[PDB]
Amino acid sequence: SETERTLVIIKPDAVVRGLIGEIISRFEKKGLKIVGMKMIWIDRELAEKHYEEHREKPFFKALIDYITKTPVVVMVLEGRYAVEVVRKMAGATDPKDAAPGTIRGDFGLEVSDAICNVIHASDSKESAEREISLFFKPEELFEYPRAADWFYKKGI
Amino acid sequence: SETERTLVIIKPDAVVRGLIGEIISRFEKKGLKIVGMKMIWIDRELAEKHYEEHREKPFFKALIDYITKTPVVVMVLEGRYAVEVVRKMAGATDPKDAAPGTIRGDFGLEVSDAICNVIHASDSKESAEREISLFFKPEELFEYPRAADWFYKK
Amino acid sequence: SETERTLVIIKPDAVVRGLIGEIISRFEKKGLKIVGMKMIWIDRELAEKHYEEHREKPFFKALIDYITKTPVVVMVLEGRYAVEVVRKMAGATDPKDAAPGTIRGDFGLEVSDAICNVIHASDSKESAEREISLFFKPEELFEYPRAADWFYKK
Amino acid sequence: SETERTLVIIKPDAVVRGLIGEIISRFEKKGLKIVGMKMIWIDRELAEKHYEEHREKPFFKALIDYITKTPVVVMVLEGRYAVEVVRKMAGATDPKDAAPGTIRGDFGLEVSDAICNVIHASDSKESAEREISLFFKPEELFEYPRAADWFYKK
Amino acid sequence: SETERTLVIIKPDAVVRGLIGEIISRFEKKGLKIVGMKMIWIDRELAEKHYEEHREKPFFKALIDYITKTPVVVMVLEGRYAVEVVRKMAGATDPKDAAPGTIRGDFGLEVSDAICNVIHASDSKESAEREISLFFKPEELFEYPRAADWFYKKGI
Amino acid sequence: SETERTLVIIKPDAVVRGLIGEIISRFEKKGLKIVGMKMIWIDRELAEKHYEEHREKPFFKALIDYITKTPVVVMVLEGRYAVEVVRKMAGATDPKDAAPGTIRGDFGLEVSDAICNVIHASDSKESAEREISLFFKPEELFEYPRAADWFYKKGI
Ligand SMILES: Nc1ncnc2c1ncn2[C@@H]1O[C@H](COP(=O)(O)OP(=O)(O)O)[C@@H](O)[C@H]1O
Ligand SMILES: Nc1ncnc2c1ncn2[C@@H]1O[C@H](COP(=O)(O)OP(=O)(O)O)[C@@H](O)[C@H]1O
Ligand SMILES: Nc1ncnc2c1ncn2[C@@H]1O[C@H](COP(=O)(O)OP(=O)(O)O)[C@@H](O)[C@H]1O
Ligand SMILES: [Cl-]
Ligand SMILES: [Cl-]
Ligand SMILES: [Cl-]
Ligand SMILES: [Cl-]
Ligand SMILES: [Cl-]
Ligand SMILES: [Cl-]
Ligand SMILES: [Cl-]
Ligand SMILES: [Cl-]
Ligand SMILES: [Cl-]
Ligand SMILES: [Cl-]
Ligand SMILES: [Cl-]
Ligand SMILES: [Cl-]
Ligand SMILES: [Mg+2]
Ligand SMILES: [Mg+2]
Ligand SMILES: [Mg+2]
Numbered sequence: 054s055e056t057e058r059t060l061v062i063i064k065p066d067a068v069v070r071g072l073i074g075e076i077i078s079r080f081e082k083k084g085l086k087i088v089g090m091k092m093i094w095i096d097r098e099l100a101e102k103h104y105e106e107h108r109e110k111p112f113f114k115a116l117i118d119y120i121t122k123t124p125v126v127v128m129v130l131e132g133r134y135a136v137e138v139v140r141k142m143a144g145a146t147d148p149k150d151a152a153p154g155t156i157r158g159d160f161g162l163e164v165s166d167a168i169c170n171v172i173h174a175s176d177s178k179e180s181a182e183r184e185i186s187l188f189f190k191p192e193e194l195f196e197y198p199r200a201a202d203w204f205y206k207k208g209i
Numbered sequence: 210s211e212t213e214r215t216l217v218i219i220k221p222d223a224v225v226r227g228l229i230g231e232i233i234s235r236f237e238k239k240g241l242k243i244v245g246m247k248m249i250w251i252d253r254e255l256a257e258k259h260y261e262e263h264r265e266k267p268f269f270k271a272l273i274d275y276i277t278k279t280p281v282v283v284m285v286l287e288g289r290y291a292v293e294v295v296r297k298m299a300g301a302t303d304p305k306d307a308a309p310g311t312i313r314g315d316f317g318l319e320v321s322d323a324i325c326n327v328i329h330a331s332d333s334k335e336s337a338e339r340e341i342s343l344f345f346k347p348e349e350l351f352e353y354p355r356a357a358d359w360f361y362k363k
Numbered sequence: 364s365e366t367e368r369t370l371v372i373i374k375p376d377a378v379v380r381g382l383i384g385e386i387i388s389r390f391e392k393k394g395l396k397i398v399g400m401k402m403i404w405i406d407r408e409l410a411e412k413h414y415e416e417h418r419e420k421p422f423f424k425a426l427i428d429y430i431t432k433t434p435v436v437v438m439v440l441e442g443r444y445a446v447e448v449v450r451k452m453a454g455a456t457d458p459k460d461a462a463p464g465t466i467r468g469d470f471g472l473e474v475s476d477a478i479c480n481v482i483h484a485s486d487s488k489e490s491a492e493r494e495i496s497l498f499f500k501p502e503e504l505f506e507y508p509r510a511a512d513w514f515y516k517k
Numbered sequence: 518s519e520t521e522r523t524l525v526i527i528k529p530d531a532v533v534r535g536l537i538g539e540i541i542s543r544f545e546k547k548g549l550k551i552v553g554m555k556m557i558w559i560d561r562e563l564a565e566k567h568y569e570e571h572r573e574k575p576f577f578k579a580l581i582d583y584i585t586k587t588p589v590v591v592m593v594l595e596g597r598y599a600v601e602v603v604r605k606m607a608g609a610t611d612p613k614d615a616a617p618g619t620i621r622g623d624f625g626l627e628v629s630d631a632i633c634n635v636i637h638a639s640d641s642k643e644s645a646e647r648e649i650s651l652f653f654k655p656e657e658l659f660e661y662p663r664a665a666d667w668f669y670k671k
Numbered sequence: 672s673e674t675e676r677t678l679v680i681i682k683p684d685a686v687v688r689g690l691i692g693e694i695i696s697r698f699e700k701k702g703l704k705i706v707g708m709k710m711i712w713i714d715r716e717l718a719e720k721h722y723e724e725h726r727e728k729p730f731f732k733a734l735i736d737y738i739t740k741t742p743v744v745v746m747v748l749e750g751r752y753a754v755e756v757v758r759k760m761a762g763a764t765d766p767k768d769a770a771p772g773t774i775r776g777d778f779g780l781e782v783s784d785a786i787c788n789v790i791h792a793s794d795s796k797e798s799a800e801r802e803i804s805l806f807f808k809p810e811e812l813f814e815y816p817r818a819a820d821w822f823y824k825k826g827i
Numbered sequence: 828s829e830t831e832r833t834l835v836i837i838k839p840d841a842v843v844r845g846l847i848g849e850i851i852s853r854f855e856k857k858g859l860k861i862v863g864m865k866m867i868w869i870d871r872e873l874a875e876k877h878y879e880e881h882r883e884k885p886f887f888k889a890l891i892d893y894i895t896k897t898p899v900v901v902m903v904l905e906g907r908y909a910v911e912v913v914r915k916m917a918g919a920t921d922p923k924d925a926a927p928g929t930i931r932g933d934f935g936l937e938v939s940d941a942i943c944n945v946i947h948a949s950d951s952k953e954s955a956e957r958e959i960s961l962f963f964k965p966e967e968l969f970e971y972p973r974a975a976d977w978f979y980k981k982g983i
Binding site: 532533534535536537538539540541542543544545546551552553554555556557558587588590592657659661662663664 | 842843844845846847848849850851852853854855856861862863864865866867868897898900902967969971972973974
């Protein structure tokens with residue numbers, strides 16, 4: 054199955070700037086399905102867990118202050134090769150490097166002690182699975198049809 | 210006290226058509242704050258609690274089927290006179306009657322045995338209170354600053 | 364029978380300014396279905412047939428010149444109460460009078476010897492029938508499903 | 518003489534929130550012409566001249582603080598009945614009262630000790646004249662063709 | 672003359688999803704001129720003719736079912752180097768590979784038995800001429816000025 | 828300081844086509860700050876000064892006629908690495924080559940005797956300084972906070 058799920062976090066800079074809907078519309082427009090979503094306020098413990106791979110890096114602390122600065126919207130996107138697709142849609146990590154057309158390329162630039170880059174997107178299928186489990190319980194993820202789902206069915 | 214909170218439900222028809230982001234952006238652009246939000250799939254019991262006032266109407270059952278058809282996004286919006294403002298933004302109950310510019314006016318039209326109208330909005334501060342308590346726990350509602358909040362203070 | 368068809372003409376002024384896509388998207392977003400559509404250049408004879416009701420008005424000639432000025436896009440839209448809905452979406456005949464949110468309200472203003480107002484919309488089911496027969500053959504009108512058609516059925 | 522000019526001020530609240538381009542595009546899309554425009558920071562003396570009619574109102578001081586809070590974009594728009602049209606596009610003075618579709622309706626809501634409403638628009642041809650003379654010299658206003666100007670001539 | 676014409680087909684997935692206007696707006700915004708356009712329902716015979724170059728390929732049949740699934744909107748775009756430009760605007764054949772900013776990059780992803788990719792765009796000047804002739808008669812293509820045409824005239 | 832200022836000129840083709848607001852919105856959306864802006868009608872003398880580096884090139888004259896054809900909107904953009912960022916946002920000099928997503932990629936294509944390309948963007952920090960000084964007096968450039976400025980402050 055080419056169908057997979059990735060985790061997206063609309064970071065504090067996007068929420069504060071009122072970019073939630075515009076970010077969501079890009080995924081819906083692409084044809085990606087939102088199977089799970091909710092606004093939460095990430096606490097230090099969960100933040101460090103999500104970014105446990107950066108535990109031993111200089112910028113770590115700035116990154117924690119950042120993702121926990123205000124509530125965020127975490128969501129699970131479902132679709133064909135969603136992980137690489139959503140990663141492509143996100144753009145380069147540093148928004149100034151992200152190309153015009155991507156989420157970071159159009160909405161990101163300014164930074165604090167952390168490289169504020171609009172959203173988070175699972176980098177691999179493996180990370181996707183770990184991160185989705187860290188923010189969502191099975192009961193929060195749903196299976197339902199989007200309008201055009203019928204159109205793509207593999208013949209008879 | 211002009212700042213109030215209202216409960217909005219992005220109904221199954223909007224979720225299916227991929228209109229969640231567009232509806233949300235209208236509120237963010239208005240200056241309204243999202244203090245709570247989550248995708249959930251409402252069951253008949255909860256749906257009937259939310260729509261209690263319509264239990265004696267002919268269209269009740271079709272309304273419950275409709276609101277429970279697929280997942281929805283329930284959210285709480287905060288801002289100056291949020292309740293009447295969101296209701297103003299929503300438009301007439303029957304999409305064909307909603308004026309261009311409103312959410313129901315621009316996105317709604319087609320119906321089933323229920324009058325599909327994109328979103329739900331609390332009709333009073335009292336109703337919003339009741340509706341928010343049905344879908345959220347205080348721990349799911351947040352107090353934080355939006356970018357321009359400082360511009361209006363003092 | 365709430366499903367009806369209406370004839371819309373994206374007038375020369377909209378075609379020239381590159382507003383075809385924006386006008387079409389408003390209908391698609393409303394939930395209306397495009398069952399027919401083609402770019403054509405109307406000649407005086409056909410233009411006068413379409414505008415028969417105005418043959419005795421002072422602005423008739425300028426209206427024919429206007430509608431035949433450049434190519435236009437004629438199209439048929441299908442949906443619940445399509446006729447009154449599209450008319451609602453269009454707005455007042457004179458763009459300066461059309462409310463913000465409507466197509467004439469947002470895109471129209473400037474005029475010539477004719478009141479240039481972006482698009483034309485049938486004013487009744489009877490008129491739509493007549494107007495569609497003027498521009499299309501049954502073979503140019505289609506019956507097919509739009510993505511969310513299933514959501515409203517049964 | 519239907520072509521007129523009106524003075525619009527994109528107020529501090531719109532400049533701060535990054536709404537300058539969106540407000541301008543609404544006018545360009547309507548068919549209105551920008552014949553003058555510049556970002557400036559109004560001082561109390563000039564602000565009070567612009568708002569002379571309100572010197573005896575309770576909210577005067579807060580209005581001057583507001584309009585002089587940060588830089589603004591003052592601009593002159595030209596077009597058929599520009600004054601009433603822009604006022605129509607702006608919407609009710611109090612954003613909560615402005616209808617969806619209007620600039621104040623879509624972008625305004627929150628207030629301070631002043632009713633923050635995104636933009637200012639001359640209320641008459643006479644007022645526009647006065648207001649334009651306050652912010653521009655004839656050398657800052659231009660006469661040039663917009664892309665579709667030819668479509669409406671002759 | 673740098674001015675040329677290419678054929679664009681807003682495939683069934685775009686029509687069904689209500690993306691006709693948004694696709695048209697991108698070309699109009701670019702400055703391209705629509706000289707011909709119409710909604711038709713492509714029959715097997717015409718579809719196989721249009722895609723006669725893929726006649727001897729595996730995916731052929733899936734492609735035919737696809738382009739003939741529902742009505743489509745065929746249109747002729749005119750403008751400076753329109754063929755390469757419109758091809759660039761379209762994005763990579765498989766939507767998941769198309770870059771954010773292109774038509775396939777923003778609107779395409781999911782596939783059926785066919786690689787559903789929003790629109791069709793002539794790949795060469797030669798193909799453009801053959802395809803335009805296959806869908807449009809000379810009487811359906813017009814010559815008229817767009818608003819800003821006067822602005823680009825080559826001095827006196 | 829990563830913070831810098833670049834000069835942008837919304838050329839005559841953009842003004843005539845009513846693209847001023849859409850071009851401005853892209854920079855505001857990116858997070859760039861407009862510290863100076865005004866509509867002017869560039870005279871030959873100032874135009875040749877701005878493009879003094881192309882004085883000894885063939886296309887020079889066409890370029891002058893172009894930028895002075897109608898009023899333009901000149902503005903000063905402020906933000907982190909604004910010069911390279913705005914240059915990236917602009918796209919390739921010839922609009923047909925600019926990628927979908929950039930300003931020239933989405934709005935530019937047709938040309939006159941000059942390669943009409945929507946806007947001008949300082950190519951270097953050095954050019955930025957010379958050009959900004961050529962169109963703006965210190966009194967026309969302001970320092971004020973944008974809504975989200977507080978969010979990016981470097982911790983305590
Ligand atoms: N007459 C009706 N027939 C079928 N469904 C209806 C009817 N009236 C309302 N509905 C549905 O029930 C919902 C709630 O009804 P009501 O509260 O009266 O409208 P509103 O959502 O504007 O407050 C409506 O939004 C619509 O989804
Ligand atoms: N008084 C007028 N002077 C010039 N042109 C007019 C006038 N009234 C209407 N028109 C033009 O004739 C068209 C058809 O007229 P009418 O059917 O009355 O308006 P509508 O298009 O809203 O149904 C109008 O859309 C406009 O293009
Ligand atoms: N009652 C009020 N209290 C505070 N501020 C107000 C009040 N009324 C108006 N204002 C502010 O003063 C501005 C000018 O007032 P007025 O001219 O009456 O409204 P308008 O801008 O719609 O012409 C309003 O746009 C708003 O910014
Ligand atoms: Cl990138
Ligand atoms: Cl869908
Ligand atoms: Cl309404
Ligand atoms: Cl804000
Ligand atoms: Cl109206
Ligand atoms: Cl649909
Ligand atoms: Cl209003
Ligand atoms: Cl124009
Ligand atoms: Cl690509
Ligand atoms: Cl044009
Ligand atoms: Cl580029
Ligand atoms: Cl900001
Ligand atoms: Mg109710
Ligand atoms: Mg009529
Ligand atoms: Mg006033």
